[PDB]
Structure 1
Amino acid sequence: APVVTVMGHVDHGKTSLLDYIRRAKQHIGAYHVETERGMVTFLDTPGHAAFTAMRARGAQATDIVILVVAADDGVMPQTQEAVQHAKAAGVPIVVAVNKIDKPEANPDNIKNGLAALDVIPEEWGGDAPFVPVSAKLGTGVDELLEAVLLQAEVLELKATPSAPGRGVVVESRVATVLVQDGTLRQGDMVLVGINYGRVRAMLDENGKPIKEAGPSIPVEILGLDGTPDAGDEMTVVADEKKAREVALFRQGKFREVKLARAHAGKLENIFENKKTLNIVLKADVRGSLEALQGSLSGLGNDEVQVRVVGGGVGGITESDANLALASNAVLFGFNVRADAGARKIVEAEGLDMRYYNVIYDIIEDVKKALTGMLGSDLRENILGIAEVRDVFRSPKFGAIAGCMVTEGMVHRNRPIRVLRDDVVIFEGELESLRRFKDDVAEVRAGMECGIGVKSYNDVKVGDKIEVFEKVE
């Protein structure tokens, strides 16, 4: 009885397939279906973003993952990101073409498009299965439900019924847990993550009250003193003082491990702490991604092997940061900046995150990291940010844009970058800046000004302008 997570591109059929499967044989976070070949359960929330977030806390609540693609407009970049996320942990991947109920959409380019992703099918090399399904039409459910269990061909031992409570939390709305090992008879003391309580309500997916929990079945518990996190682990204790002592020891241990990760996980400590140095790469364009991947694929043979575990085009989404945290890798943003959630995750944990705007710099830094004598605190710094709120261009010289300066100081003697959607578009120099039509040469923090950049008039609303100095 494995655990299934649905993964795929947006608007491809993940929710539709999950709903059809549930209806064939009240949203809490998980559900289960009984089949003659064997019971199989699914998690309500699909997508790799939620899958890796709980992965990052060592939960490992996945057994088999299924990709859903479409015969039309198939294998989009998010599908590649999802398969990367599934392979980083390491699980068998079962793929399924969903929209095979379209006006002659051929499920043939999908196979040889996904083949060049280490998802080689059976008829090609014999590595992964391919199934035609259709949530709308209904043809293909039986094949998928047989293949999900057929490809689950590991020992699958343990999960002993008579065992102490051991499960993982899913959704802390009252909460829900999908227990891995043991039984969850109500009334006994329970330690759910950093939390203590007693089992008073033990509702099921359909709301029918029960008292016993299956080996790999979900259950919604209610009665705890509050709300734990979404990736913690739950067990059974006996003494409330024991639970409190365990909670305080967990505070101490987490506070120690955060500093240990922020220390050893930096790029500067690669040689000291093989080890198969992992990196997570983000680039502004596909060419600068492929070139960097080809350069970083081979670097050092006898000592340390560098393998890229990510690779995407756009800003540093919090899913990318969660993947890097789970894989304990090093961020690498080439001409791309992080978002708010990525900034939050990087601030919380260690997450060595360094930016670059030159291809050679990344190879140089990685070579020194493998060598072990790299220099620290180099390659410029950020000294000011402004947000563009209005762009006006008179028909005599149109380059001025109104900007609100946020958390920094913008000046005239330093080069600038202009970026949209956390992606840079131009890196030149500052031509003019003025307040109240007065040509001031220094704008403080929190102020408002009018900025015009030389030899570039394309600024729009909601941009960002960063000012930096090459300091060595």
Structure 2
Amino acid sequence: EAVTRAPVVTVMGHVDHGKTSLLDYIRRAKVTQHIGAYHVETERGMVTFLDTPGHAAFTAMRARGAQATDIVILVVAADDGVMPQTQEAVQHAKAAGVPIVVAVNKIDKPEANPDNIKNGLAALDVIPEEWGGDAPFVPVSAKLGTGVDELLEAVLLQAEVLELKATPSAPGRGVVVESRLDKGRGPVATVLVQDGTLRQGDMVLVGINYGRVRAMLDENGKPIKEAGPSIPVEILGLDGTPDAGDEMTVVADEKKAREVALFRQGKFREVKLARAHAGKLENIFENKKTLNIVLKADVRGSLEALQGSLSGLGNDEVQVRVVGGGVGGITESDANLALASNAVLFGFNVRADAGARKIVEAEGLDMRYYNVIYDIIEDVKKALTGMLGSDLRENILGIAEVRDVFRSPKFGAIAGCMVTEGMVHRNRPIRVLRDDVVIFEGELESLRRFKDDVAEVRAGMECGIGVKSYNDVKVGDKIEVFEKVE
């Protein structure tokens, strides 16, 4: 007993390219409210969609050890194709080998030629199915509606090539898409069943949480008694809100459920400490392994130069291959990608965000900032040969956030600020960063509070700061102060 269950499609692409519009058009044109997933049936078969644009949540639920997605559809606007963020989607979908279907969206415009997309995307191992072929190219239009049926046909044709094996008789097993709390009904989950069946009444374990399905809502808001092999449902009964990547399984009784939950929490507690020591760049050589890196530069040119330089490294003892690469700060999505791929973070003139910081703290993965290009490559080659491993170089002691700017016309750029980390003192170099990208690098000019010139400010104390031979310090910047460790 075995049948083809369903394909699961995730929509990814650049911002403002039509992900939400394409996602909504199929839902509103095939047959309110949203739960996190839905499904539509065609003549050849039925396919399910996760109504959440990807490249962010696609990896978030993958780093926990679950792969609900088996088809990824890229959307690129005909007008202006392939943005420095479609490449990020390509790398995210290539880290976990999944079929990709490309669908140009904005073809209902004068300047909407698709051939520049076809050959520009061709140099990404996404060559079209007319010259070589590993991915189709169907033109759709979310607003007008043309070409969608061909898109569904292409998705189904790509899917039928894969395994598509499931048994709609075994005890249910699946993954949770999203969870939410409500004063009525308490905690609510949006589990996606993958194999078996989830008839109402079963004893359900989801990660740490456990319970039973006292109520079940379908995707359209109507209660149902049974769940298919790949039909998303919304269950009630768990004792706490689950995460977005846990596994839902059917067990026998509550005692076994509690034993498994305690074992799972113990294992999760134990796993975290291993990455905090075995995941560092100084321990990769010790214990091929194809060392992976994630790079976040500040300017595209430096990123291209660094990728070109890091090309010819690694012959027989460990190899190097970048799995990321983008312009901007270290987004939490990049940290999730590195965690799922067991890579290491490299930050060129960029700082991690709050979410990136908390993900780094939880996963305990290596994360280092670098100032000059050649230090990155020298550290990479030194770690490849595995000779030395220590911090040094620089250590940030004190970060201050500007509040307001009152630059006086008497050749001054005095900016008010409040210290949010560490302490700031006079005779150290400073570093002004806006939008997590550094803009200036130099010393100070004045750090008085009102007129005292304290030359040392404790954390949490408002003061005024002055940058030497620099201006245009807007509101919302940060000043970090560091030491060139010798």
TM-score by length of 2: 0.94
Matched with 2:198 is 184
Q: Which moved more, 1:394-403 or 1:250-259?
A: 394-403
Aligned length in residues: 472
1:89 aligned onto 2:96 = yes
Deviations 1:292-318 (A, max 9, x none): 111222211111110000000011111
By how many angstroms is 1:395 displaced? 2.1
Deviations 1:388-410 (A, max 9, x none): 11222222212221121222111
- Taking the aligned partners of 1:85 and 1:143, their CA distance within structure 2 comes to 25
| Alignment partner of 1:448 out of 445, 459, 462 | 462
1:154-303 correspondence to structure 2 within 5 Å: 154-173=161-180, 175-303=189-317
Q: Which moved more, 1:152-161 or 1:256-265?
A: 152-161
Deviations 1:58-93 (A, max 9, x none): 111110000111111322222111111111111111
Q: Is the 8 A contact 2:426 2:455 kept in 1?
A: yes
Deviations 1:22-77 (A, max 9, x none): 12222111101111211110001112101110011011111000011111132222
Secondary structure class of the residue paired with 1:179:
strand
- Taking the aligned partners of 1:105 and 1:349, their CA distance within structure 2 comes to 44
- Taking the aligned partners of 2:288 and 2:160, their CA distance within structure 1 comes to 31
Secondary structure class of the residue paired with 1:21:
helix
- Taking the aligned partners of 1:104 and 1:367, their CA distance within structure 2 comes to 46
Secondary structure class of the residue paired with 1:218:
coil
Q: Is the 8 A contact 2:207 2:264 kept in 1?
A: no
- Taking the aligned partners of 1:167 and 1:404, their CA distance within structure 2 comes to 48
| Alignment partner of 2:380 out of 363, 366, 382 | 366
Q: Is the 8 A contact 1:381 1:469 kept in 2?
A: yes
TM-score by length of 1: 0.97
Q: Is the 8 A contact 1:183 1:213 kept in 2?
A: yes
- Taking the aligned partners of 2:167 and 2:95, their CA distance within structure 1 comes to 28
Q: Which moved more, 1:230-239 or 1:8-17?
A: 8-17
Matched with 1:132 is 139
Deviations 1:347-404 (A, max 9, x none): 1111211110111111111112111222212211011111111222222212221121
- Taking the aligned partners of 1:446 and 1:128, their CA distance within structure 2 comes to 55
Q: Which moved more, 1:59-68 or 1:392-401?
A: 392-401
- Taking the aligned partners of 2:485 and 2:137, their CA distance within structure 1 comes to 54
| Alignment partner of 2:68 out of 42, 58, 61 | 61
Q: Is the 8 A contact 1:190 1:199 kept in 2?
A: yes
By how many angstroms is 1:155 displaced? 4.2
Q: Which moved more, 1:105-114 or 1:460-469?
A: 105-114
Secondary structure class of the residue paired with 2:201:
coil
By how many angstroms is 1:178 displaced? 1.2
Secondary structure class of the residue paired with 1:149:
helix
Q: Is the 8 A contact 2:201 2:212 kept in 1?
A: yes
Q: Which moved more, 1:300-309 or 1:434-443?
A: 434-443
Secondary structure class of the residue paired with 2:133:
coil
Matched with 1:410 is 424
Q: Is the 8 A contact 1:262 1:349 kept in 2?
A: yes
Secondary structure class of the residue paired with 1:48:
coil
Q: Which moved more, 1:16-25 or 1:437-446?
A: 437-446
Secondary structure class of the residue paired with 1:363:
helix
Q: Is the 8 A contact 1:179 1:217 kept in 2?
A: yes
- Taking the aligned partners of 1:333 and 1:160, their CA distance within structure 2 comes to 46
By how many angstroms is 1:412 displaced? 1.3
Deviations 1:131-159 (A, max 9, x none): 11011221101110111011224342431
Deviations 1:217-253 (A, max 9, x none): 1111112222111110010111211111111111110
Q: Which moved more, 1:359-368 or 1:71-80?
A: 71-80
Q: Is the 8 A contact 1:297 1:308 kept in 2?
A: no
- Taking the aligned partners of 2:293 and 2:360, their CA distance within structure 1 comes to 15
- Taking the aligned partners of 1:135 and 1:402, their CA distance within structure 2 comes to 48
- Taking the aligned partners of 2:472 and 2:25, their CA distance within structure 1 comes to 48
Q: Is the 8 A contact 1:7 1:48 kept in 2?
A: yes
Assess, with a 3 A threshold, how the Cα gap between structure 1 residues 429 and 159 changes in structure 2: closer, same or farther: same
By how many angstroms is 1:215 displaced? 1.7
- Taking the aligned partners of 1:449 and 1:176, their CA distance within structure 2 comes to 49
Deviations 1:420-453 (A, max 9, x none): 0010011111122212122332222222222111
Q: Is the 8 A contact 2:422 2:458 kept in 1?
A: yes
Q: Is the 8 A contact 1:391 1:460 kept in 2?
A: yes
- Taking the aligned partners of 1:88 and 1:220, their CA distance within structure 2 comes to 30
Q: Is the 8 A contact 1:204 1:210 kept in 2?
A: yes
- Taking the aligned partners of 1:376 and 1:343, their CA distance within structure 2 comes to 21
Q: Is the 8 A contact 1:365 1:374 kept in 2?
A: no
Which runs of 5 or more structure 1 residues have no equivalent in the other structure? none
By how many angstroms is 1:346 displaced? 0.8
- Taking the aligned partners of 2:283 and 2:384, their CA distance within structure 1 comes to 9
Q: Is the 8 A contact 2:432 2:480 kept in 1?
A: yes
Q: Which moved more, 1:211-220 or 1:42-51?
A: 211-220
By how many angstroms is 1:330 displaced? 0.2
By how many angstroms is 1:116 displaced? 2.1
- Taking the aligned partners of 1:89 and 1:469, their CA distance within structure 2 comes to 40
Q: Is the 8 A contact 1:387 1:403 kept in 2?
A: yes
Alignment RMSD (CA, Å): 1.4
Q: Which moved more, 1:156-165 or 1:127-136?
A: 156-165
Q: Which moved more, 1:455-464 or 1:433-442?
A: 433-442
Q: Which moved more, 1:249-258 or 1:179-188?
A: 179-188
Secondary structure class of the residue paired with 2:179:
coil
- Taking the aligned partners of 1:404 and 1:411, their CA distance within structure 2 comes to 13
Q: Which moved more, 1:74-83 or 1:25-34?
A: 74-83
- Taking the aligned partners of 2:453 and 2:175, their CA distance within structure 1 comes to 61
- Taking the aligned partners of 1:105 and 1:375, their CA distance within structure 2 comes to 52
1:153 aligned onto 2:160 = yes
Q: Is the 8 A contact 2:7 2:164 kept in 1?
A: no
- Taking the aligned partners of 1:450 and 1:103, their CA distance within structure 2 comes to 54
Q: Which moved more, 1:119-128 or 1:246-255?
A: 119-128
Assess, with a 3 A threshold, how the Cα gap between structure 1 residues 104 and 386 changes in structure 2: closer, same or farther: closer
Q: Is the 8 A contact 1:274 1:305 kept in 2?
A: yes
- Taking the aligned partners of 2:145 and 2:255, their CA distance within structure 1 comes to 54
Secondary structure class of the residue paired with 1:378:
coil
Q: Is the 8 A contact 1:277 1:307 kept in 2?
A: yes
By how many angstroms is 1:96 displaced? 0.5
By how many angstroms is 1:123 displaced? 2.6
Secondary structure class of the residue paired with 2:39:
strand
